[PDB]
Amino acid sequence: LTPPVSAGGIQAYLLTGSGAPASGLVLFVVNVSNIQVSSSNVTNVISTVVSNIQINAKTENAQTGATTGSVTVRFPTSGYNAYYDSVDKVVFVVVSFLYPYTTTSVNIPLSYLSKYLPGLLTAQPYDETGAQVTSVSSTPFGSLIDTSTGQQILGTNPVLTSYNSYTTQANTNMQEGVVSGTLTSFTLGGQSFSGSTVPVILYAPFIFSNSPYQAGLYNPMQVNGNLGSLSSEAYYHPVIWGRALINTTLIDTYASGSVPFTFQLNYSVPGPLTINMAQLAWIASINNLPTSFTYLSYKFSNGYESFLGIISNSTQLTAGALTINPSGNFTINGKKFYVYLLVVGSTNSTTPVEYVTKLVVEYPSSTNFLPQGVTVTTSSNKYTLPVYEIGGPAGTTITLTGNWYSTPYTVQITVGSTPTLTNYVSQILLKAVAYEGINVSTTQSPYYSTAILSTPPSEISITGSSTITAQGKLTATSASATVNLLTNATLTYENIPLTQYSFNGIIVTPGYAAINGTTAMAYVIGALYNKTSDYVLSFAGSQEPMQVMNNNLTEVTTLAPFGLTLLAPSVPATETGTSPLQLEFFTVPSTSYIALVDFGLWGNLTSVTVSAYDTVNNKLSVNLGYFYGIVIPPSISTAPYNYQNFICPNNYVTVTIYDPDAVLDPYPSGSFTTSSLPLKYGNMNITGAVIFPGSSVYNPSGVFGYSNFNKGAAVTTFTYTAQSGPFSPVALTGNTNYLSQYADNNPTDNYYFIQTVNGMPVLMGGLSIVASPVSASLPSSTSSPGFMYLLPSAAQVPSPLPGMATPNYNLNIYITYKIDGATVGNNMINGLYVASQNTLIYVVPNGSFVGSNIKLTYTTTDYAVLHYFYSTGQYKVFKTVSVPNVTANLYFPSSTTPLYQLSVPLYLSEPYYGSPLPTYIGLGTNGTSLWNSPNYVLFGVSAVQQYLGFIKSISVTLSNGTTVVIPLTTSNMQTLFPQLVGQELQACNGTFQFGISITGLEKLLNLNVQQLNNSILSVTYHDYVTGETLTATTKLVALS
């Protein structure tokens, strides 16, 4: 039982799952373990308990939560069914609320109920009236008493009517049924009873939940206050970036356990877009080609080459010594035509260059001028047609001879020196639709919570409408015409004789960067001029989307034909006409994000609607969820730092990168993978994305939703793992071929996700580091993706949704010198390294510390940011941290020092020498300074003896003005400094103390004890770190 039921309390539970008798059954229970009961008085205890139960029944509007009717009821004094179980020590009763068992009783096998009341397999329950029985019967709802009235519930009452009619009620009226209960407090047997149940839901339609988030979706990052202006509206205007997951909750009362859900997303942009389109192929009748022209075949991103298509009556095309055999044939009303496909290029070749798999030509039917079509086939009726190559050195000219109907024609191609690219540019009202699926489980039915992708890696269909227009002159014997389409594509017709056809047409592909050559649409338009009662010039046209894969250009589907007609009763005349036209492109999977950015469908204006389908039960959502798209530029920042940030081991510099577009999964450390399959939706099977949580990539089979579906072994599993070397890097491990199928939150690898084409990533985003003057960089040319485990910070407890991500990534930088030249096994510690999750360490020599610098360049991870902010440069952000110069000092405590005292301290001070205690500087030779710091550690490496400076001179100027310079020798030092070592005085305050000794100085000079020695002492030290030369002086004093 979940939840458990307290001493002397009441609770209610819904009967569900496999083998459940019927819908709308609830079991009420009261805990009676607190007292003793016997066969003598069991009927008294059940009587006492069941007398005190009160039940409330409501109806509500499923979206708003508004109550629409309420009744409150009580068990009768006789004729009800209620039981006692000796084993579990509980009294229990079952009520049936919904159709058909509203007025009649239903029987519940005791095998089933044992899920909730396990005692029932051990002993049969006590009945009312003290008997024992093998089977349980419901008390029906329509038998209970209205507390308002003192009578049995009215058959006419609206709540009872509703519950009895729930089937049509829920769907049509968005009505939802809810029940709760309470036990009116009483004392029995020296114990007391009190409680109120949680409420329970009998039925509800399948909807997006609309409380409190009115839009049905939400983005945790916006609800917590982290998105600025956009946090004012998180309850009714959700936004998300390109490739990320947005959260959602569905209410589902039909489901049991886990359910696969399928989703459909429709995107729209206000107002039309201007589209740029490149000519893949050009097909004409031999009569329509111009006399002489220059041509050279273009080569597209996917390797395919443009081709030139001649249609002719002649069984070969002839060109002197060379003859061309036709790629295919077709027939119209017994007349037979041949189709020749050529690539103009390098050298005459006898084998196919590439292929085209189906191709539809449309023509006006002779009878009715309605459109009809045929697919061109090979001479053995196979569909795939081959393309051949002709050509030679530039400026070579080739004459091709053919026939159109009765008449011979000759055409003269010049082989160009540079590829012919024709661009057409038009305005079109674009829209796109996409599909996706996920497997979802719950612990709080009927609420199912999940998240869906913003843009999926499926096929996506881009679609939109446009206009074609025709202009023309008709005469007694022949007709002339031109057409415009796609704004500035132009086709022309040489004068068409009566009863003759003529063809022209073009194939385009999208003329953007990488998606070129991957997909297409083809239009071919046939014309016919004939005499009826009237002179009629008619056009008919095909419309087919096409895709290229493995060098076959193939038809995906055919949409409907279109036609236009120009009519003249007069013999000479001039005319015009128009028709709508349609356009459709199917993206190939890997290209699908790129498409949406380039055509302009994703951007700050885009708006998206979502519907959802239950794969177990065959139901669709009766309401829709909504969200809006956004693109946001990155930012870099630092908290203000002084020199203090670089002294002792626990001091570092923090940089914050703000980049929300890098956060693909709302939960930090969350991970998912993705593949493409057929998905069940509606009553159809459609190519779509399946999202799988975790870190393993699958190549599945069958259809998602049905029983065929099987994900095999993990092809690869990606993991961050520790590695050897100093510190210990954590870096990504796994087969790099599959990175375009894995998502994380780490910007050092998120750039691959849906942004890899032909096996190279489009945008070399992420974080890049250069360092100076010790030259190093990450990533180096050899370095893997995912060179460090950088992850975003979590929202804390005062926020509405804790534990969720935030757009801040916090990155720690250490620069240090004290562990330079340390060794860790085979490793020598010098340069730039990664440590832990979010840390970099740079170790530089003593002479290079001040002025060292690190420059961080962060480049956006998302292709939308690169596209919208290319010109302004707001796609990269830079920052530098660098070590500032600082003033050291050397000083005797006082200007005058007495000769009476044996030792007079000389203190040195320099911030960057400081460390944890103990630390000491030793002196030797010609005054060379050695620094030691045994307790110093940084991520496991410990400090080495450093050589940091020297005492430069010591001199005394005497009372007669003579100046003596004391020579620094290993023997002289030991007298002047009885301890050759100076200690640090306090932690991280670099201030060292030395004991220059007057008792030594006298003997070292051989000068008369005091009588001569009214003198000025002078001392000097040079440090390598800054480069400064410090000096200190004192007047030696006695009675003079």
Ligand SMILES: *[C@@H]1O[C@H](CO)[C@@H](O[C@@H]2O[C@H](CO[C@H]3O[C@H](CO)[C@@H](O)[C@H](O)[C@@H]3O)[C@@H](O[C@H]3O[C@H](CO)[C@@H](O)[C@H](O)[C@@H]3O)[C@H](O[C@@H]3O[C@H](CS(=O)(=O)O)[C@@H](O[C@@H]4O[C@H](CO)[C@@H](O)[C@H](O)[C@H]4O)[C@H](O)[C@H]3O)[C@H]2NC(C)=O)[C@H](O)[C@H]1NC(C)=O
């Ligand atoms: C593919 O195969 C094609 C079909 O056979 C070849 O086409 C033929 O190309 C000839 C040029 O090719 C030669 O030169 C290039 C260097 O530029 C080499 O790479 C080639 O290997 C080859 O040696 C072309 O000849 C014309 O250009 C020549 C320049 O070298 C020159 O002889 C003339 O200027 C030619 O006009 C062919 O075009 C036809 O040529 C004949 C003459 S012939 O066949 O060359 O002997 C002409 O007939 C003449 O017309 C004139 C009118 O002024 C009369 O005075 C004369 O009595 C009569 O002979 C035709 O007018 C002319 O069209 C051309 N053949 C055709 C018809 O297509 C092609 O080279 C191969 N391509 C490669 C390199 O892969």
Ligand SMILES: *[C@@H]1O[C@H](CO)[C@@H](O[C@@H]2O[C@H](CO[C@H]3O[C@H](CO)[C@@H](O)[C@H](O)[C@@H]3O)[C@@H](O[C@H]3O[C@H](CO)[C@@H](O)[C@H](O)[C@@H]3O)[C@H](O[C@@H]3O[C@H](CS(=O)(=O)O)[C@@H](O[C@@H]4O[C@H](CO)[C@@H](O)[C@H](O)[C@H]4O)[C@H](O)[C@H]3O)[C@H]2NC(C)=O)[C@H](O)[C@H]1NC(C)=O
């Ligand atoms: C928005 O909707 C998101 C859906 O993507 C929710 O993300 C899911 O978050 C889970 C943690 O969230 C919990 O805690 C937060 C507070 O921080 C609450 O707001 C939430 O209500 C919730 O209580 C996370 O579950 C995992 O972490 C849990 C520890 O908190 C742990 O109990 C679980 O056992 C999970 O490991 C989901 O993260 C992923 O979970 C899947 C498993 S499952 O999806 O939970 O079933 C893991 O995949 C597995 O990986 C192993 C590798 O060892 C494989 O062997 C196995 O094949 C594979 O199943 C992932 O490793 C793990 O990252 C997380 N879902 C995803 C896909 O990221 C988010 O919470 C929702 N927001 C709100 C506010 O509710």
Ligand SMILES: *[C@@H]1O[C@H](CO)[C@@H](O[C@@H]2O[C@H](CO[C@H]3O[C@H](CO)[C@@H](O)[C@H](O)[C@@H]3O)[C@@H](O[C@H]3O[C@H](CO)[C@@H](O)[C@H](O)[C@@H]3O)[C@H](O[C@@H]3O[C@H](CS(=O)(=O)O)[C@@H](O)[C@H](O)[C@H]3O)[C@H]2NC(C)=O)[C@H](O)[C@H]1NC(C)=O
């Ligand atoms: C349909 O209308 C379109 C109007 O946008 C035309 O597209 C634009 O065409 C410009 C002219 O070049 C065209 O003529 C070629 C030679 O016959 C032919 O191969 C193509 O049809 C080709 O598009 C084109 O200019 C380019 O070429 C010029 C000539 O070499 C050169 O001077 C330019 O620098 C440029 O490379 C347009 O591209 C844009 O041109 C701008 C200057 S201007 O030439 O338009 O005055 C330039 O500032 C800009 O950077 C550049 O993008 C091209 N426009 C676009 C966006 O595609 C199209 O040709 C018309 N279709 C037909 C029937 O040909």
Ligand SMILES: *[C@@H]1O[C@H](CO)[C@@H](O[C@@H]2O[C@H](CO[C@H]3O[C@H](CO)[C@@H](O)[C@H](O)[C@@H]3O)[C@@H](O)[C@H](O[C@@H]3O[C@H](CS(=O)(=O)O)[C@@H](O)[C@H](O)[C@H]3O)[C@H]2NC(C)=O)[C@H](O)[C@H]1NC(C)=O
């Ligand atoms: C009626 O009342 C008593 C008091 O409320 C209560 O017993 C307490 O609950 C369970 C036993 O019953 C539950 O668990 C079993 C499965 O183990 C199921 O079959 C039952 O249907 C119940 O769900 C014991 O766990 C309690 O002992 C204590 O439990 C604490 C957690 S709790 O959430 O379960 O209460 C632990 O922290 C303690 O360490 C542990 O001692 C027991 N409480 C006591 C001390 O009496 C029953 O739930 C109710 N009666 C029955 C039999 O259902």
Ligand SMILES: *[C@@H]1O[C@H](CO)[C@@H](O[C@@H]2O[C@H](CO[C@H]3O[C@H](CO)[C@@H](O)[C@H](O)[C@@H]3O)[C@@H](O)[C@H](O[C@@H]3O[C@H](CS(=O)(=O)O)[C@@H](O)[C@H](O)[C@H]3O)[C@H]2NC(C)=O)[C@H](O)[C@H]1NC(C)=O
């Ligand atoms: C279909 O695909 C090919 C291959 O990707 C593409 O060629 C690449 O075009 C870019 C620029 O694209 C724009 O200009 C051309 C005209 O030059 C237009 O046709 C396009 O519509 C675009 O407006 C060329 O610059 C590429 O050359 C490369 O430039 C790179 C820098 S970039 O930022 O400019 O891209 C360098 O890093 C490369 O070293 C250099 O090769 C060119 N790429 C290649 C590999 O040749 C076609 O233009 C596309 N054509 C169609 C039908 O649009």
Ligand SMILES: *[C@@H]1O[C@H](CO)[C@@H](O[C@@H]2O[C@H](CO[C@H]3O[C@H](CO)[C@@H](O)[C@H](O)[C@@H]3O)[C@@H](O)[C@H](O[C@@H]3O[C@H](CS(=O)(=O)O)[C@@H](O)[C@H](O)[C@H]3O)[C@H]2NC(C)=O)[C@H](O)[C@H]1NC(C)=O
């Ligand atoms: C910090 O960096 C300084 C400045 O670059 C460097 O000083 C250089 O000292 C070396 C000798 O140091 C070696 O011995 C001591 C033992 O006392 C060790 O602690 C060190 O680890 C070294 O093994 C001197 O050779 C340099 O003096 C000059 O060298 C020039 C050539 S160079 O290529 O060596 O620089 C000559 O042309 C000059 O005539 C000579 O004066 C000295 N470098 C300079 C330019 O002053 C320290 O060793 C580094 N200190 C530590 C320990 O990190």
Ligand SMILES: *[C@@H]1O[C@H](CO)[C@@H](O[C@@H]2O[C@H](CO)[C@@H](O)[C@H](O[C@@H]3O[C@H](CS(=O)(=O)O)[C@@H](O)[C@H](O)[C@H]3O)[C@H]2NC(C)=O)[C@H](O)[C@H]1NC(C)=O
């Ligand atoms: C799509 O719309 C976004 C929302 O306006 C644009 O994002 C804004 O980008 C600009 C810089 O170009 C910047 O002003 C915003 O940064 C925030 O500014 C806020 C001030 S206010 O605008 O709310 O008054 C600050 O409160 C906040 O700390 C800054 O982070 C930025 N807005 C957001 C959401 O961060 C985006 O530029 C635009 N994209 C396109 C296609 O141009």
Ligand SMILES: *[C@@H]1O[C@H](CO)[C@@H](O[C@@H]2O[C@H](CO)[C@@H](O)[C@H](O[C@@H]3O[C@H](CS(=O)(=O)O)[C@@H](O)[C@H](O)[C@H]3O)[C@H]2NC(C)=O)[C@H](O)[C@H]1NC(C)=O
């Ligand atoms: C372009 O020409 C193709 C042949 O050059 C045509 O292919 C023929 O199509 C017919 C009808 O679809 C098909 O039955 C032929 O297959 C042959 O059938 C022969 C008997 S009969 O049909 O001639 O009576 C048999 O000998 C044998 O089964 C097949 O060889 C097929 N002909 C060949 C030679 O393959 C094609 O229809 C035409 N394309 C269009 C669209 O006009």
Ligand SMILES: *[C@@H]1O[C@H](CO)[C@@H](O[C@@H]2O[C@H](CO[C@H]3O[C@H](CO)[C@@H](O)[C@H](O)[C@@H]3O)[C@@H](O)[C@H](O)[C@H]2NC(C)=O)[C@H](O)[C@H]1NC(C)=O
């Ligand atoms: C587009 O043309 C392709 C020719 O390369 C062809 O793809 C190959 O198909 C084979 C098996 O198909 C046989 O039949 C075709 C007839 O077009 C032959 O050309 C081919 O050699 C085979 O005998 C298969 O091994 C593989 O998918 C492709 N071969 C290669 C080079 O790997 C396609 O059949 C055709 N259209 C489509 C996609 O149906």
Ligand SMILES: *[C@@H]1O[C@H](CO)[C@@H](O[C@@H]2O[C@H](CO[C@H]3O[C@H](CO)[C@@H](O)[C@H](O)[C@@H]3O)[C@@H](O)[C@H](O)[C@H]2NC(C)=O)[C@H](O)[C@H]1NC(C)=O
């Ligand atoms: C940190 O500031 C110091 C104090 O101003 C400064 O040392 C003093 O200035 C000069 C040194 O200038 C020479 O040295 C530099 C660095 O090698 C060279 O660019 C060039 O040869 C300069 O002429 C020195 O003579 C003077 O004694 C120093 N003053 C004191 C107080 O003793 C440092 O130069 C400075 N460090 C850096 C790298 O910025």
Ligand SMILES: *[C@@H]1O[C@H](CO)[C@@H](O[C@@H]2O[C@H](CO)[C@@H](O)[C@H](O)[C@H]2NC(C)=O)[C@H](O)[C@H]1NC(C)=O
């Ligand atoms: C019903 O009868 C049983 C006895 O058969 C009761 O148990 C006794 O209760 C008294 C006080 O209530 C206790 O002092 C005894 O220890 C119990 N005797 C036995 C035989 O166990 C039980 O409590 C009775 N229930 C009610 C509600 O009266």
Ligand SMILES: *[C@@H]1O[C@H](CO)[C@@H](O[C@@H]2O[C@H](CO)[C@@H](O)[C@H](O)[C@H]2NC(C)=O)[C@H](O)[C@H]1NC(C)=O
């Ligand atoms: C989302 O786009 C889909 C296009 O796939 C649309 O659903 C189609 O609805 C039309 C009638 O409007 C029917 O001809 C088709 O049966 C539907 N298509 C499919 C494949 O099921 C619809 O226009 C858009 N739906 C929304 C949410 O507005």
Ligand SMILES: *[C@@H]1O[C@H](CO)[C@@H](O[C@@H]2O[C@H](CO)[C@@H](O)[C@H](O)[C@H]2NC(C)=O)[C@H](O)[C@H]1NC(C)=O
């Ligand atoms: C196109 O030219 C071809 C040349 O092959 C002509 O084909 C003729 O076809 C008819 C059958 O209708 C036969 O009687 C002749 O034997 C063929 N003539 C020749 C010379 O081969 C045909 O005349 C022309 N087609 C059109 C549409 O005018």
Ligand SMILES: *[C@@H]1O[C@H](CO)[C@@H](O)[C@H](O)[C@H]1NC(C)=O
């Ligand atoms: C100190 O200077 C003397 C004299 O120039 C020289 O002999 C000696 O090698 C120097 N010692 C060191 C190690 O600094």
